């Protein structure tokens, strides 16, 4: 009579997006989170025979493969498997009700879905559609799991925030519209991953690595700055902002990311630290990495990996103009929330990511992730960039005496507490300032604080 084929498929988009907590994006697309199943209605040309077989196929990226977990083939089943799976929940005439699930280890990104039918000793194959798959912070087994509901709403679902600024004397704040839900922004942030060096040099590997928030996170720390890769923002601290916008003139991420796209992925002029941190925050919250913005007053820039900010004098008092070490009035970066399978169970939670081009890391302006817990314990041999970030929050300022004749130098004074003050992020639910200094280091003036500093100096 006729072979089994698909008439139409209802993705039940509204319903699934609500369940997957993606209902807030301004988009007509099916946006999903990994690990969580979704339900679809598939209207066939007939009932299922008990000799016929349906096979689902999903792929993401340009060189998808089973081995790399970027393509999957799975039968319509009654058995719930481990990986990708499709469960037949009911048949009603020609209509099948199907529950499809993704692994909690699946690469995030855009996927294509196809169905392959074996019937009447023949094989057919049709494209069903496409969807977006994000990280899933509601899912206890996802690496980005954040169990507390209030915290999740803040650090994922909140599209407006507050960055602290100024100096120790005079702390202020500015509003920032993260704007992750506005039109095209989720899409642009996905674009970013497809334009990294990582991807340009080995797309197949890059896309397989998108299952991992450590990887996605660090790529973003590179790609949000123009350096190296034609990323989103170009920094300028000259004071003269000719040929572009004054950094103090941006109010959020949306203009920036759009202007980047519209110029054909050409850098946007110009940004400073808070502008990098705010734009990176949009990207992180978009993709499902809970994140927030951190400000640090008296932030050290150490330029020689010794955990100290060095000033230099002749033994007579005259100041020798040597060293590059400096200290900012304030600096701003991001923390993202994930477990660290590369490090150990004791190192999960908040991870520093910094898109402001200060120092290079494996030749590139990138920075993090760095276990905040790690930084506090002085465990600075760990990945990534932990000496730089230790210096930022807990450098000692040292004045040195240098004898030109003999080339001897020695310590003169040490100031062990001027660096890293009033470290700050927006409150959950309100616009109050949380202090998180004690999360980054032991209490200034204490014993432990000095014994870490020592530990850390020996870990270099």
């Amino acid at each position: 009579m006729a072979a089994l084929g698909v008439q139409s498929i209802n993705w039940q988009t509204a319903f699934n997006r609500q369940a997957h907590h993606t209902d807030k994006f301004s988009s007509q697309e099916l946006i999903l989170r990994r690990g969580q199943n979704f339900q679809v209605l598939m209207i066939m040309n007939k009932g299922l025979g008990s000799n016929e077989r349906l096979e689902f196929i999903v792929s993401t990226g340009p060189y998808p493969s089973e081995s790399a977990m970027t393509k999957a083939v799975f039968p319509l089943s009654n058995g719930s498997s481990g990986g990708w799976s499709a469960v037949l929940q009911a048949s009603n005439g020609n209509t099948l009700t199907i529950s499809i699930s993704s692994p909690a280890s699946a690469p995030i990104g855009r996927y294509t879905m196809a169905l392959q039918i074996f019937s009447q000793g023949g094989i057919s194959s049709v494209k069903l559609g496409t969807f977006i798959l994000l990280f899933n912070p509601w899912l206890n087994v996802d690496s980005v799991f954040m169990g507390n509901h209030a915290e999740r709403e803040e650090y994922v679902q909140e599209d407006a925030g507050i960055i602290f600024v100024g100096s120790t004397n005079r702390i202020g704040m500015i509003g920032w519209n993260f704007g992750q839900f506005e039109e095209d922004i989720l899409s642009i942030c996905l674009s970013i991953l497809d334009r990294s060096l990582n991807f340009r040099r080995d797309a197949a590997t890059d896309v397989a690595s998108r299952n991992d928030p450590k990887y996605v996170g660090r790529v973003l720390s590179a790609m949000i700055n123009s350096n190296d890769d034609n990323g989103v923002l170009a920094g300028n601290w000259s004071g003269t902002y000719t040929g572009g916008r004054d950094p103090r003139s941006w109010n959020g991420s949306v203009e920036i990311l759009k202007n980047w796209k519209k110029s054909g992925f050409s850098p946007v002029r110009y940004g400073q630290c808070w502008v990098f941190a705010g734009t990176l925050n949009t990207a992180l919250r978009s993709l499902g990495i809970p994140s927030r913005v951190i400000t640090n007053f008296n932030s050290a820039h150490d330029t020689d990996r010794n955990l100290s900010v060095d000033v230099y004098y002749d033994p007579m008092g005259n100041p020798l103009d040597k060293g590059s070490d400096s200290v900012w009035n304030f600096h701003v970066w991001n923390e993202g929330w994930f477990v660290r399978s590369d490090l150990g169970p004791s190192y999960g939670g908040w991870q520093v990511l910094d898109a402001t081009p200060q120092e290079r890391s494996q030749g590139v302006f990138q920075c993090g992730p760095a276990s905040v817990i790690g930084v506090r314990e002085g465990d600075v041999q760990l990945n990534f960039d932990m000496p730089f970030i230790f210096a930022e929050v807990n450098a000692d300022r040292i004045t040195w005496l240098y004898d030109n004749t003999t080339g001897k130098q020695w310590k003169n004074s040490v100031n062990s507490h001027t660096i890293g003050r009033y470290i700050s992020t927006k409150a959950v639910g309100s616009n109050a300032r949380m202090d998180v200094t004690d999360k980054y280091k032991y209490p200034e003036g204490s014993d432990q604080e000095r014994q870490v500093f020592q530990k850390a100096l020996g870990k270099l």
């Epitope: 002749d314 007579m316 030109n404 004749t405």
Partner: antibody, heavy 118, light 113 residues
Framework: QITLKESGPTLVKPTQTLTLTCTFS??????????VGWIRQPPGKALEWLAL???????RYSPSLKSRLTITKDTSKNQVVLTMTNMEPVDTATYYC??????????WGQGTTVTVSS | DIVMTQSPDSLAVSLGERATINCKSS????????????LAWYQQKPGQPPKLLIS???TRESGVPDRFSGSGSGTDFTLTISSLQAEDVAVYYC????????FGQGTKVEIKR
């Protein structure tokens, strides 16, 4: 006022080992930033700087003579010792110790003369 | 490395005349960071050790008569004795302390009479 006095064997036979001792008064080699050094002057010739020790027992030597030289201080006795090996007649000279702080070598001993002879 | 070359090699001035003594350096002994000249001048009377007249090219040590003045910068330096007394007869050495210590060969100064 500062003063320094050298002391040790005046005579010293070839391929032996010279040991000189500087005794000083009117400063401490325990003060930060302070150094004592040695110089020698062969009969009718130019002064040659030999070595230098700091308060924290950092040291520097003439690069040409490093292998022969040794400098120690005994800060309890206000004394600094010099050890030159393989004394040949070429090394017959007057041997000075000197104080140093921030400047050059500002205050010198009277100097003791050292003869290398069988 | 650094080599100190004095001129002249010897010198006789009449009592109360000006005596000039020069020193040249292999290299600049001027540290760019403090803009100070690491050069010194000594005097050596017979039977005595050298006595330091002048550090930093030009600053004179506590207690030294005003008639001794030091000039120069970089690699060319000059020790001037404005009015030579009978008791100034001696050997004048220049010295660099930019990189460890090296001395000039010395210049002998006598009274022409």
């Amino acid at each position: 006022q500062i003063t320094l006095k050298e002391s040790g064997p005046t005579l010293v036979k070839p391929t032996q080992t010279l040991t000189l001792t500087c005794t000083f008064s009117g400063f401490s080699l325990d003060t930060s930033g302070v150094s004592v050094g040695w110089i020698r002057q062969p009969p009718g010739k130019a002064l040659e700087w030999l070595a230098l020790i700091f308060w924290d027992d950092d040291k520097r030597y003439s690069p040409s003579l490093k292998s022969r030289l040794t400098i120690t201080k005994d800060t309890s006795k206000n004394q600094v010792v010099l050890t030159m090996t393989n004394m040949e007649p070429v090394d017959t000279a007057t041997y000075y110790c000197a104080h140093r702080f921030v400047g050059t070598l500002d205050v010198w001993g009277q100097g003791t003369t050292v003869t290398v002879s069988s | 490395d650094i080599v100190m070359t004095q001129s002249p090699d010897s010198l006789a001035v009449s009592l109360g005349e000006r005596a000039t003594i020069n020193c040249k350096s292999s290299q600049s002994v001027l540290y760019s960071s403090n803009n100070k000249n690491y050069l010194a001048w000594y005097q050596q009377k017979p039977g005595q050790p050298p006595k330091l007249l002048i550090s930093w090219a030009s600053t004179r040590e506590s207690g030294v008569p005003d008639r001794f003045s030091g000039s120069g910068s970089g690699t060319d330096f000059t020790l001037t004795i404005s009015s030579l007394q009978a008791e100034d007869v001696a050997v004048y050495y220049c010295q660099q302390y930019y990189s460890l210590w090296t001395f000039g060969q010395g210049t002998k100064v006598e009274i022409k009479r």
